[PDB]
């Protein structure tokens, strides 16, 4: 096993310190049953 | 939707102590209490102890408070909302009313009245207290007998004789056959070994195209019995 | 307690569902920051659309008049509000929430509407 | 929002058992290096 | 036994997106590339708040933030070199 | 246990039965909930009923359950073949861990009669060398599950080495068991024939082996 | 039926006022697209601004306390409702829309507020 080192691409560097992060976007609306209803009309 | 696992079976020597494990998967094992619940022919059903994986807590009744020791692992991710996990129970001056079968069971609930409430449960692990030693069984073969001389079909299988203690498992073409198979409880003798039976019932055309192996698995002792139930007959009825 | 932000997003839906003023908080507050605000505000105000047709606009919890159609999901109470987590949750009845959505304007709103106008016609 | 896995021996991509949320990173220094990288966050426990 | 759906705003739910993302830094006294004229100053104070019992997956190597990152700094290198001397002539 | 159950209780088929579960204050209604499991011998049980009323998971709503201030209930409704067996109720609290009950076995009445099936089995060759011999009786399929096993040597009773287990349910809901006779060489060869006979209230079956073929 | 949007902007203005829900929908769903969403927000959160100001936030039909006065138009309701759409009538209607919202605000919400004040006031 021989190892060489290389840089070939720079985004390796942005890598190496986002490897933790990642990003969400929030769905704030849940819909869920209970045994509720509204007024009746 | 998940499988509980338990450790194989153990024979121990009364005063000694074992150690059972119960692996699980198919579900978020910090969510759910284990709970451990032991079932002996003198006491009934009994329920021991639960642990929490995620803060540790644990309840034991009385009577266990002093001889369990319960303990967890931490969970081995393996998707966002699923893991695998491991708890132990240690359970020490065994004497011989703690013969019997023991299970652990995951939690009902994350929160409610009854979160810790055993509801998925595992397959079971059978502890044998004794000052007797361990003793591999002996396998001999049954020949085929006539079922139904117009149906054409017979049952044939293999004896499992003087064995110590339990359990024995019997599979038939290494798990290929399934079908038809029949194995009996076994029988306790006045010497103290068990000894049981099991029988597969085929058609009686099938001598020329189908192999019949019996594997017995006594694994207490680490034995495996691959043995040829001979297909010749000596039943009349059968001859015809 | 109070945990924070997305604090009870591992807990128990009845328990996450306690603290939705939390998420609602912070759920609102050169061109790469203003194509993002605007992205932001454009997500705000659909979601707030969203409970528009619903008749909801002011809260953050509304019953409804649909009823639970148990092709969707057939768990219970208790094994839904104590057992499970409002992101699993939300993946098991990912494959409803626009149908629910078009339920949930039509079969209420838009018939609680014209019984609204028929009843205050007098 | 951004989702931080606080793992310490966090093997590049799976599942992160303690994580956190933030608004923004921490201070990401822009070097530019080739080989070897400079002036950076350092794994804590065993070397990643 | 009659249950009815309920909508709940606000709900811990989240999906993987990706998204125009800036800049923040703590002002200081000039002028390199990175910060430029002006980036937004960051909060005295971030709120990093743990998550209890939450499990994600993550994936480094399929990260748009990389990629975001990357094309920042290659656009920032022009949008400073713009303004400077460029020397044509000197390929005597 | 101090937890009481009635011992047994029967219904028949296609209609309810109910079992109880009850005990001292110390241990009963008001103050804790009941749970209710379905517990077959040999295998794991299955939760059908907790916190009273409420009914697990997948339970089908033949089940339901009851408490009152002195004792708790449990009705299973429509029984079935597989509804034959044991069943156990817990009292617990959030806190406390279950107490489980003394136990009731369900017999169900109106079932259909099953024809015992027997088979005999000699010694083997390999046996006989050792030098023991055992014939082994093997009973499956019969209903209901209770039977009787006799021995017999030249036509005359047998009374030294019979063991004979206890009968077991089979997974078609049948029920099965098994029968040992043990012997030495010398009482296998001086006889003209041995017979294994089971008894039924029903049908009386008769099996024999020759140590002649 | 369901027409789709604008489906009955043709039919009468009764008819047309059952399917308020499916106009509403999509009316809130580099440069130019920017500044197009910015306008586009812009407008909607115009209208629910003055629905905010006539107190009918969360509601697509609201009544008032305004009269209608007959200046306005001598039509009644038989011939408003079922002979009438909606675009001629707002062509009818666009000289009093800024007056008619004038009195909107201040006929009644500029005076149901001062009125509810003085009414929690015990
Ligand atoms: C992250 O996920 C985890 C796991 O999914 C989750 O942890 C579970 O959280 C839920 C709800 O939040 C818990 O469910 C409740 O548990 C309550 C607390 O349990 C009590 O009883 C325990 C056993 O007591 C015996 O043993 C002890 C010795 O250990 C002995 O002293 C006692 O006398 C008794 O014999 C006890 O260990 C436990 O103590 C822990 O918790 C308390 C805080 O409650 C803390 O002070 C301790 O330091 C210790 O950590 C505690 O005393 C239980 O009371 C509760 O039941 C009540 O509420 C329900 C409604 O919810 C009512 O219906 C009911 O009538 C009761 O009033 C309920 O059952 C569960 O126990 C957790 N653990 C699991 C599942 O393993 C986290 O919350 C998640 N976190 C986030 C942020 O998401
Ligand atoms: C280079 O590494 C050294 C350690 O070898 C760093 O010095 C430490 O910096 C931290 C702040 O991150 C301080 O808490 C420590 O007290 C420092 N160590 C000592 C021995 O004083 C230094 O910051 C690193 N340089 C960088 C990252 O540019
Ligand atoms: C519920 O879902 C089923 C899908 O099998 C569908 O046929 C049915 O119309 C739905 N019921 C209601 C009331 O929406
Ligand atoms: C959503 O639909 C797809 C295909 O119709 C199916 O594979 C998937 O299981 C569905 N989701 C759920 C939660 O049933
Ligand atoms: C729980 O869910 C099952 C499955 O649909 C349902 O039949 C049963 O009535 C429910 N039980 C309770 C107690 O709500
Ligand atoms: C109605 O319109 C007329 C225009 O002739 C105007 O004089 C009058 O004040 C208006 N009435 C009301 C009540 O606003
Ligand atoms: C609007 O006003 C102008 C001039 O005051 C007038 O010509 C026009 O007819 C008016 N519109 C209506 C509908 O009366």
């Known amino acids: 096993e021989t190892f060489r080192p290389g840089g070939g691409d720079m985004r390796d560097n942005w890598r190496s310190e986002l490897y933790k992060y990642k990003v969400v976007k929030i769905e704030p609306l849940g819909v869920a049953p209970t045994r509720c209803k509204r007024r009746v009309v | 939707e998940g499988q509980l696992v338990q450790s194989g079976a153990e024979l121990k020597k009364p005063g000694a102590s074992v150690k059972i494990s119960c692996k699980t998967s198919?579900?978020?094992?910090?969510?759910?209490?284990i709970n451990w619940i032991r079932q002996t022919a003198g006491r009934g059903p009994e329920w021991m102890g639960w642990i929490s994986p995620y803060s540790g807590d644990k309840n034991l009744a009385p009577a266990f408070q002093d001889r369990v020791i319960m303990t967890t692992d931490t969970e081995v991710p393996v998707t966002s909302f699923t893991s695998t996990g491991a708890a132990y129970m240690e359970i020490r001056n065994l004497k011989f009313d703690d013969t019997g079968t023991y299970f652990c069971?995951?939690?009902?609930?994350?929160?409610?009245?009854?979160?810790?409430?055993?509801?998925?449960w595992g397959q079971g692990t059978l502890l044998t207290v004794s000052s007797a030693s361990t003793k591999g069984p002996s396998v001999f073969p049954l020949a085929p007998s006539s079922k139904s001389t117009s149906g054409g079909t017979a049952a044939l299988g293999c004896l499992v004789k003087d064995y110590f203690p339990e359990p024995v498992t019997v599979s038939w073409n290494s798990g290929a056959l399934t079908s038809g198979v029949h194995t009996f409880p076994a029988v306790l003798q006045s010497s103290g070994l068990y000894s049981l039976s099991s029988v597969v019932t085929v058609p009686s055309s099938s001598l020329g195209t189908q192999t019949y192996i019996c594997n017995v698995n006594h694994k207490p002792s680490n034995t495996k019995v691959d043995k040829r139930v001979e297909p010749k007959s000596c039943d009349k009825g059968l001859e015809v | 307690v109070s945990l924070g932000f997305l604090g009870a997003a591992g807990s128990t839906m009845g328990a996450a569902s306690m603290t939705l003023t939390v998420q609602a908080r912070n759920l609102l507050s050169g061109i790469k920051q203003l194509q993002a605000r605007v992205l932001a505000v454009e997500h705000y105000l659909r979601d707030q659309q969203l409970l528009g047709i619903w008749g909801c606009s002011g809260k953050l919890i509304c019953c409804t008049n649909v009823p639970w159609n148990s092709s969707w999901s057939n768990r219970n109470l208790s094994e839904i509000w104590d057992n499970m987590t409002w992101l699993q949750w939300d993946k098991e009845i990912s494959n409803y929430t626009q149908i629910i959505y078009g339920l949930l304007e039509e079969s209420q709103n838009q018939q609680e509407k014209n019984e609204q106008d028929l009843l205050a016609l007098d | 929002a951004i989702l931080k896995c606080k793992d310490k021996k966090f093997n590049g991509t799976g599942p992160c058992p303690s994580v956190s949320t933030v608004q923004c990173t921490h201070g990401i220094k822009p070097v530019v290096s080739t080989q070897l990288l400079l002036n950076g966050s350092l794994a804590e426990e065993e070397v990643i | 036994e009659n249950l009815w759906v309920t909508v709940y705003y606000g709900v811990p739910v989240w999906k993987d997106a990706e998204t125009t993302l800036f800049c923040a830094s703590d002002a200081k006294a000039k002028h390199n590339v990175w910060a430029t004229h002006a980036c937004v100053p960051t909060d005295p104070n971030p709120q990093e708040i743990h998550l209890e019992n939450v499990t994600e997956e993550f994936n480094m190597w399929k990260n748009n933030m990389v990629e975001q990152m990357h094309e920042d700094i290659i656009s920032l290198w022009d949008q400073s070199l713009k303004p400077c001397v460029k020397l044509t002539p000197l390929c005597v | 246990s101090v937890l009481t159950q009635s011992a047994s209780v029967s219904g028949s088929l296609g209609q309810s039965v109910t079992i109880s579960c009850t005990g001292p204050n110390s241990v009963c209604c008001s103050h804790k909930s009941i749970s209710w499991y379905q517990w077959p011998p040999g295998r794991a049980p299955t939760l059908i009923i907790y916190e009273d009323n409420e009914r697990a998971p997948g339970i089908s709503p033949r089940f339901s359950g009851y408490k009152s201030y002195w004792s708790a209930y449990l009705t299973i409704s429509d029984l079935r073949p597989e509804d034959e067996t044991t069943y156990y109720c817990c009292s617990y609290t959030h806190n406390s861990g279950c107490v489980f009950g003394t136990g009731t076995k369900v017999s169900v009445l109106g079932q259909s009669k099953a024809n015992p099936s027997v088979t005999l089995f000699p010694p083997s060759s390999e046996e006989l060398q050792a030098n023991k011999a055992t014939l082994v009786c093997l009973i499956s399929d019969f209903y209901p599950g209770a039977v009787t096993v006799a021995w017999k040597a030249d036509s005359s009773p047998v009374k030294a080495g019979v063991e004979t287990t206890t009968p077991s349910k089979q997974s078609n809901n049948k029920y099965a068991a098994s029968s040992y006779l043990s012997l030495t060489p010398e009482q296998w060869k001086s006889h003209r024939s041995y017979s294994c006979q089971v008894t039924h209230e029903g049908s009386t079956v008769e099996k024999t082996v020759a140590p002649t073929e | 039926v369901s027409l789709g949007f604008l489906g009955a902007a043709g039919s009468t203005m009764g008819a047309a006022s059952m399917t308020l829900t499916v106009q509403a929908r999509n009316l809130l769903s580099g440069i130019k697209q920017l500044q197009a969403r910015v306008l586009a927000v812009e407008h909607y959160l115009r209208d629910q601004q003055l629905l905010g100001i006539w107190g009918c936030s969360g509601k697509l039909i609201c009544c008032t306390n305004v009269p209608w006065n007959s200046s306005w138009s001598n039509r009644n309701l038989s011939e408003i409702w079922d002979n009438m759409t909606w675009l001629q009538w707002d062509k009818e209607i666009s000289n009093y829309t800024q007056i008619i919202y004038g009195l909107l605000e201040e006929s009644q919400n500029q005076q149901e507020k001062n009125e509810q004040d003085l009414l929690a006031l015990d």
């Open positions: 198919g579900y978020r094992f910090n969510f759910y209490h």
């Open positions: 069971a995951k939690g009902l609930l994350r929160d409610g009245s009854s979160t810790w409430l055993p509801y998925l």
